[PDB]
Amino acid sequence: TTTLAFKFKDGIIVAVDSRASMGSFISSQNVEKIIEINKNILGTMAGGAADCLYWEKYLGKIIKIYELRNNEKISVRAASTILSNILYQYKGYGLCCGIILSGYDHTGFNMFYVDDSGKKVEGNLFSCGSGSTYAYSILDSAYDYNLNLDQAVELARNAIYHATFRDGGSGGKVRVFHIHKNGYDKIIEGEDVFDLHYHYTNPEQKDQYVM
Amino acid sequence: TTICGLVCQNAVILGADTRATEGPIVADKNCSKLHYISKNIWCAGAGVAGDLEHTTLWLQHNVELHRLNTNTQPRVSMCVSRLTQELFKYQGYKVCAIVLGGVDVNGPQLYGIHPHGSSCLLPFTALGSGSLNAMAVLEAKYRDNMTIEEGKNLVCEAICAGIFNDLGSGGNVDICVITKDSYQHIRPYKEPTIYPKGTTPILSEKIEYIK
Amino acid sequence: MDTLIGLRGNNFVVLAADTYSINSIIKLKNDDNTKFYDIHGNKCLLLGGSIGDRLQFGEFIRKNVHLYQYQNNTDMFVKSFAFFTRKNLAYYLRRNPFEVNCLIAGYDKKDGYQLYWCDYLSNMDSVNKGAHGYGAYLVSAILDKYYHENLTVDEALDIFKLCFEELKKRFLLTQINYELRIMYDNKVETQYVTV
Amino acid sequence: MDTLIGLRGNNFVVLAADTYSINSIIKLKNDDNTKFYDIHGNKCLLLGGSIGDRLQFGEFIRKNVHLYQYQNNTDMFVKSFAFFTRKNLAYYLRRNPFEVNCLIAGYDKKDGYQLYWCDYLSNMDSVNKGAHGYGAYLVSAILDKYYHENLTVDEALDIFKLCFEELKKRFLLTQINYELRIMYDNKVETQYVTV
Amino acid sequence: TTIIGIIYDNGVMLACDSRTRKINRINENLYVCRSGASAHSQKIIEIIKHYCVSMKNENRKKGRFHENLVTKNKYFYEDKFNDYNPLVENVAHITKKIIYTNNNFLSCALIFGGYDKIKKQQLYAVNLNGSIIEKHDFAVSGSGSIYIQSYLQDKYKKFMTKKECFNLILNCVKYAMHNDNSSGGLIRIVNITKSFVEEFTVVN
Amino acid sequence: TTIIGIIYDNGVMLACDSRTRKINRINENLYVCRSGASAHSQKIIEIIKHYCVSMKNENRKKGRFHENLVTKNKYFYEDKFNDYNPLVENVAHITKKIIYTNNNFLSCALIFGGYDKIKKQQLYAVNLNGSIIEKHDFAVSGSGSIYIQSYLQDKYKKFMTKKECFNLILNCVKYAMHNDNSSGGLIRIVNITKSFVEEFTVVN
Amino acid sequence: TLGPVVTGTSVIAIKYKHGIMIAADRKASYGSYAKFQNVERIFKINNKTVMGFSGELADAQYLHELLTRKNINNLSEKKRKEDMYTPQHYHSYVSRVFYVRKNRIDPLFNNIIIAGINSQKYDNNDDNVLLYTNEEYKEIHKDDLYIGFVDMHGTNFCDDYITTGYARYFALTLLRDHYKDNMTEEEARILINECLRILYFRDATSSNFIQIVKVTSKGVEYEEPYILPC
Amino acid sequence: IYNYNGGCVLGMSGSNCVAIACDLRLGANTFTTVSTKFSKIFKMNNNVYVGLSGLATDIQTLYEILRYRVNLYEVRQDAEMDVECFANMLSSILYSNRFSPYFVNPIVVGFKLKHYKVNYEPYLTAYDLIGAKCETRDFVVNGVTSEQLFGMCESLYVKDQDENGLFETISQCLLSALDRDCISGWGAEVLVLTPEKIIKKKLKARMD
Amino acid sequence: RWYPYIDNGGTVIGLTGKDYVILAADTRLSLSYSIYTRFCPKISKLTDKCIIGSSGMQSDIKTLHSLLQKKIQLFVLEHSHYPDIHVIARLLCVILYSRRFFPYYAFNILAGVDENNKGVLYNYDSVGSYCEATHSCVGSGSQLILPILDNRVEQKNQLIKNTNFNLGDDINFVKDAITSATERDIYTGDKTLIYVIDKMGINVNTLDLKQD
DSSP: OOOOEEEEEEEEEEHHHHEEEEESSEESSOOOEEEEEEEEEEEEEBBOHOOOOOOOHHHHHHHHHHHHHHOOOHHHHHHHHHHHHHHTTTTTTTOOOOHHHHHHHTTTTEEEEETTOOOOOOOOOEEOSSHHHHHHHHHOOOOOOSOHHHHHHHHHHHHHHHHHHHHHHSSBEEEEEEEOOOEEEEESOBBBBHHHHHHHHHHHOSOOOOO | OOOEEEEETEEEEEEEOEEESSSSSSESSSOOOOOEEEEEEEEEEEEOOOHHHHHHHHHHHHHHHHHHHHHHOHHHHHHHHHHHHHHHHHTTOOOEEEEEEOOOTEEEEEEEEEESSOOEEEEEEEEEHHHHHHHHHHHOOOOOSHHHHHHHHHHHHHHHHHHHHOOOSOOOOEEEEESSOOOESSSSSOOOOOOTTTOOOOOEEEEEEOO | OOOOEEEETEEEEEEEEOOOETTTTTTEEOOOOOEEETTTTTEEEEEEOOOOHHHHHHHHHHHHHHHHHHHHHHHOOOOHHHHHHHHHHHHHHSSOOOOEEEEEEEEEEETTTEEEEOTTTTTOOOOHHHHHTTTTHHHHHHHHHHTTTTTTTHHHHHHHHHHHHHHHHHHHSSSOEEEEEEEEETTTEEEEEOO | OOOOEEEEEETEEEEEEEOEEEEEEEEEEESSSSSSSEETTTTTEEEOHHHHHHHHHHHHHHHHHHHHHHHHOOOOHHHHHHHHHHHHHHHHHSSSSEEEEEEEEEEEEETTEEEEEEOOOOOOEEEEEESTTHHHHHHOOOOHHHOOOSOOOHHHHHHHHHHHHHHHHHHHOOOOOEEEEEEEEEEEEEEEEOO | EEEEEEEETTTTEEEEEEOOOEEEEEEEEEEEEEEEEEHHHHHHHHHHHHHHHHHHHHTTTSSSOOOOOOOOOEEEEEGGGSOOOOOOOHHHHHHHHHHHHOOOTTEEEEEEEEEEETTTTEEEEEESSOOEESSSSEEEEEETTHHHHHHHHHHOOOOOHHHHHHHHHHHHHHHHHHOOOOOOSOOOEEEEOOOOEEEEEEEO | OEEEEEOOOTSEEEEEEOOOOEEEEEETTTTEEEOOHHHHHEEEEHHOOOOOOOHHHTOOOOOOOOOOOOOOEEOOOSGGGGSSOOOOHHHHHHHHHHHHHHHOOOOOEOOOOOOOETTEEEEEEEEESEEEOOSSEEESSSTTHHHHHHHHHHHHHHOOOOHHHHHHHHHHHHHHHOOOOOOOOOOOEEOSSSSSSEEEOOOO | OOOOOOOOOEEEEEEEEEEEEEEESSSBBBBSSSSSSSSOEEEEETTEEOOOOOOHHHHHHHHHHHHHHHHHHHHHOOSSSGGSOOOOHHHHHHHHHHHHHHHHTOOOOOOOEEEEEEEOOOOSSSOOSSSSOOOOOOOOOGGGEEEEEEEEOOOOOSEEEEEEEGGGHHHHHHHHHHOOOOOOOOHHHHHHHHHHHHHHHHHHTTTTTEEEEEEEETTTEEEOOOOOOO | OSSSTTEEEEEEEOOSSSEEEEOOOOOTTTEEEEEEEOOOOOEEEEEEEEEEOOOOOHHHHHHHHHHHHHHHHHHHTTTTOOOHHHHHHHHHHHTTSSSSOOOOOEEEEEEEEOOOEEEEEEEEEESSSSOOEEEOOSOOETTTHHHHHHHHHHOOOOOOOOOOHHHHHHHHHHHHHHTTTTOOOEEEEEEEOOEEEEEEEOOOOOOO | OOOOOOOOOOEEEEEEESSOOEEEOOOOOOOOOSSEEOOOOOOEEEEEEHHHHHHEEEHHHHHHHHHHHHHHHHHHHHHSOOOHHHHHHHHHHHHHHHHHOOSSEEEEEEEEEEETTEEEEEEEEESSSEESSSSHHHHHHOHHHHHHHHHHHHHOSSSSOOOOOOHHHHHHHHHHEEEEEEHHBBSSSSEEEEEEEEEEEEEEEEEEEOOO
16 A cells, blocks of 8 residues: 655656555555546555545546536646545545545646545655555655656655565555656556565575564 | 264264364364274264363373273263263353263263253264254164164265265264274275476575484 | 644734644644635634544635625625634534634724634634643643733734743644744734744 | 664664653653663663553563572673563563563673564564664664664664654654663763754 | 143152253152253252262161152152151252352252152242242243143142143143243153152153 | 133134223224234224224215124124125234334234124234234233133134133133233123124123 | 244245145244244245245235235236246346345345246146136156245245255255155155154254145145144 | 464475475564564474464463473483474463463474384374364464465475475475465575484565 | 345456466355355356356345346447447446445456457456456455465466466366365365357356365
8 A cells, every 4th residue: 555756856756566455365466556547647546445446537537527628737736626525525434545646737746645534735745555654754864856867766666665665565566657747657667576675675695684 | 073973783883074174264184073082982072173182181081090990891971970060160161062972881872962061861963063964864864773884874874964065064984883892993984286496596595414 | 633822912813823734643744734724804714623624614614705705895804704603613513523623813993803712512702812722731821821911912922932832842742833823903924933 | 652763783782762751741751761771781671651561660670680690690691681571571461461662682792782672562572673662663664774784883873863853854743852872892871862 | 841740649740841851860759850051950960969869878877777652660769768868858958059059150940849758748949049939739840831831720639639640740741842832852750659759751 | 911812603702901901993893902012002003993994984885785790881783784894804904014014113912803794703913023814713912821822722612602702711811810910900801793792891 | 124023944845747846834933932833834926836935924924915916917917828927037026126125224034935837838727817716747847847045135046956944954955865856746745754854853943734835737736734644 | 363473384294304384574563574583483302393373472482381391301201202292292281271372373393203223204283272283194384374375285285205396395385375465474484304404494585 | 233244155266368268166155054056157148258257145246247237238239339348347347336335245357358369357356446467366265276376377486487378278277276276165166167268259168076
């Protein structure tokens, strides 16, 4: 459930894992936790997979209707408000969705955090999931504005790696996308964390890594 | 689990399955339900396996000590008495329903012991998840003063049907014949990719020679 | 959980609130802006509690007030604002609870500068000073000690600085950053303080 | 609730703990000294949890170890200390639960410098670094990133400074003051840090 | 479970069903019939049998003195004149004490029948908790008996003959089995007289 | 509460106690006895009486056709030949439906007695929930009746006379009151025959 | 609706040459009381169709009402003997009813058996139907007979023999061990008698007063009740 | 309760060779790994090993008790303990606390000695938390990942085998089982014991 | 005080090839510890190149399969083409999420062959979430077999590796996996149906398993 997204000079970086658990058992190791809501807006998944997916796609449909109607791209703030209102309509019903809506609109680059309890917040650095705390700790420690794209992707990959390292519910593959003015690009579609660990912490394959 | 017991012409016959479950999964496919108390007394139980094993061992050793001190053939009624007091002392929290068959000076006989400490003498009985089916067939075909061969055939009919019907019971069929002198234990009565060397990766190894 | 403070005196009103967005055991932001809602004219609404509930209720009340102001082409009185807010809060409490504490502040040509306390049960009443959240326990007494008639804005800010210092030094959650909203002389000023 | 941090490396060990005494919603003191317990020789025990429970358990363990050392005229080994503590904690857990998290640390001529984690259920195990309390969630990852073999004490203090800054900036309960206990070169040094 | 006890002239009779032997022989002239929890009743029966053996041995004087199918078995009393056989009242009262001291867990209703030299044939009912009542007419217990209560009350006579009491108790048990859903099987009947006890079972 | 009903030749009898008038007159040739919750029973009785009046009015043809103390009262049927009197089966079944649709809250046991031209005297039992059974011999309900069940079974005959059924039902109710602790008071009895209905009460 | 009060024991239905045979005891227990000992627990929907019962009595009666009136409606708009609904039709109907009630959380505490003949090429009984008032048997291919089960939760299926209640353990074992194909009426009756005797010995709620019904080329036949030989 | 500090232990037999493998994770609150060196396999005798899975404190307490008892017996008799005796004493110890028990599911793996020259026979067994001994003579599994290990061993077991094949099969089965569990894994360790020598190796498992 | 959920138990297996898919399933229907019948197929044919298997409440899966078949038939009638596997998957997701608060007790696998002759398998959950995969299993035996398929197909933790796989080997592997589940599980079943979807239509075979 580890999600990650931060804003820097050349746009926004979004990162996710690929694990899915039915308790103590992992149902699937490869899932897509990033959805192309619009040509310039992405949204991560945290918590209830089905609720998040269905409501993200419903929001995409609503955005399509509005954009086709008024003939102008919607803003990230408007999408966040719509999603928050719809989720709040189902308060006290069991939804456990946590979303990070990130995109570029006519105002610039924007990021928002939304929760099943209608918790709309605006910021430049967010992370939700079981491993969110570790990602936050490794971001704040080394995060900095105005760093090149390569450094941004490396930092995101390292944060996701460490989050998966100390989280049973986080793992699988790390997907890292980059959002810029004209749409987005998939820097890393999927990377097995196996070689990632054996390259970051235990470069020498001798003896167990004791922590 | 399916346990059955029957009294035949100056003899006793016990039968059981050979499958133990750890929930919806089968742990051991060739377990052994029949247990040896003395040279002329046997038991077979259903319930918590640990409780059954411990109680059976305690009863066997106590009976052996009593026989050695008294120098008389063990009596099944004594074994009943002991089990009944032991279970009643523990408020029935040691759930282990047992079928006890023996041949003492008073002739062959069968006792059913229930978790709460109550006991009842019977000519034929069955316990376990598959007890209903085995007892149904037993009552359908059972007769008094049968022959050992007919008794064993009916004991299969019981246990074999219980295996084929109930999910919690399965595997092979174990049978035991108790007589005033000597006994028989037919354990399996009926019974109805290599990887290339070096495939797995390792990062440490150490050989210690045993003295 | 969310500390709100309000001090009203002759020809001035001051509101104060910590800037924090708490989620579980971490802060989403140290620069929260969902606590203050400025109404057109001289009117401010300070809300504390769960983020979503305060967001919904504040937006609802603010936009209804704007609707009234435009459709009637006037400036709704502070008393009417406060009592309309109380009525809406009571209605929703009876139907759908809004766990939100409320501080209404305003200026009116009729009644001067005023404040209004309101609990999450809509236990609203006019007061010269008040607080909301656990931090209230650690600041209310201070407000009593140093408050006196004919106060000036500078002394009000001094009292607020004392309250912030006390909250930082003794309150379980060491709250550092605060935002101030000062209403006086037909002006609204926003200030940021860090103790 | 009470944050403990521990980092062990070749020829150095470091323990860190916030200095706060929480009662209800206020702080009795900002210089709590009930968390560290220094055993005679090179041995330290860091406890987190309820003040009374940690006081009782730490006093019991320290005075029992002192009794052993005086009776036998020697110094208890670090491993023996840690496992004796674990056994006592498990025993009391079975009879009278002790809601206390343990970080044992020390230096021995046999095993060198060593550190030991211990959960409130006595889930003790040797470790090169660790943390206790909610703040643990915000430090462990950092400890993984910057830790590497052949570390030096100065780098350890830098990592601890990073951890303290992270707790101050992101942890719900903003913790500012910390106390550090550094064991190295057969010396135990105490320091106080404020971020 | 249905349990019946009827006192006729010069004797007494007890009757029970067989569903889940409910009559137990505490002594050659002392029987008890049990209803309720099986394990509880069995343990209590063993305890009172032990107690009865103890008292019977204790009160032995020193020197010489007194110079469908109705399959049935007859047993003549070994102790003529009841020189040392325990009194039924003592056994009933010790059972009452045992039940009372453990009434927080023990839950079983017992009916005691027997013959004594002091008080002739007797019937006692020990209910839930430590309540013992001596019935001169008849005693009934178990779920089934509730259905036949009135029936018995209508057809009981002060001084019945052996055949009359036998027929009445047999019909009572048959009706109880017919109505009640948790009583059935072959009926067991025990007749205790002044000099012998005969037990027979009916398979109807 | 004890409710008993017996079908004898050319008629039917219903008897009840009085403790807390349990027999209610749905129609001149249709009575019902109620046991259980009092409020539910009374409301259902009022509703079914409303329904019975409705059906009785509806099924009327168009033109001319057919050219201790035993204090008692007699009522002759106004509708000879039962031209329009509702059938007892219809009343019983509509009551069954009403109980069924509200079985989650309604909890009451009813016994319907009456006479019809199509099927003569009848006796229906509506149990808890929407369960209806037609009894040809007799019906019993209430806590007290359980004590007399077997008794009734023993002393019932296929074709009893009026006095035999009188005595049997009176004794049944008396025994039920004697044993049951929640049934008492004077006994009320109603006799429904082909051409009249007579209601009496006994104070014994 | 809120829980069983008056309940039936069990039913056994098996298909044999000449049709199907279904047996059930005539008793409805009020807990542990056995109030009613003469109750018809096997109903009839139409020729070549009957409905079993093991559960609460009120729900069974309501379902009987529903099914019989559905049959009446079917007849009202019937023009050819092929228009009569088959046992599969009624089985699916009751399955749908049970599923809807489950979704509403107000089930019927019953386990229904719907058994009949789903073929019209063997007899001309349905060409002139007679609801009020009422040769040699014709062998029936087992493919033309239908027996369907319905559970509280809507679970349903079809097989060559079905039992409900405690009969699902004793009678089911006996049938699986001994049931044959194309057995004459005498053998089927013997097997059913053995199963019901076993139930009578080891089932408190059962009884020996038995009702046996046969659905054959001649229609539905209610045989006279008899007491088990024992 | 067993999710807290989940673990996995496995054992297989071959031709004059036995293997026991285990995971090396120690976590807390289920979804938080704390250490990656906690080994579940403890050497109790030159040819007898016990693999314990479950609550770590219970594991340590039981291991210490077993070491005490085994050392006492060995010193008193001045000879090595037999696997039969160790298994029986483990069952007795587990049952001794039937009420308020030890929340650990151990397995015993080793060699049975047949004197006459001498013979070594593989011996394996797995227990419940009460001491429900059940001999199997082939692969034994225990832990939160019991189902996956059962499936893998059923699919891959090859009866008697050379020690190299045994090591390959056990390592593959364990690695496959752990990869499908979230609260278990973080490295694996394998021991292959034979009369002549004992090999201990650690796998390059998915450490995340 | 009535719980409207019972697990009828069972197992369904699905594997994919370059241009084909194999879907096996048990044929046993059971209750808590007793078996209703020895034959109750869990695989319902949706189109000529798409089938669905499910595990859980038998009534729920039957109703869901019938409803999905009705929707597909209506779509074909009103649009004049057979929906693709992706369309069917999304429609099934919508149907499942419709009952978000009274969810079906049905775990679903949707197998088919795309218009480009690619084997596609979609695995769902009880409430709507779904994801494409190259191998899947649902039912009681899921936890048991999933590691076996993982080792066989993905072939991680291996160095030699062997990716040469054809239809016959896949069928034999599926049969071995289902036999292992039957041996090591109680709810698995006794007779299994193996559906094979290839470019040239679909085929069905039957295999006999243990009866315990």
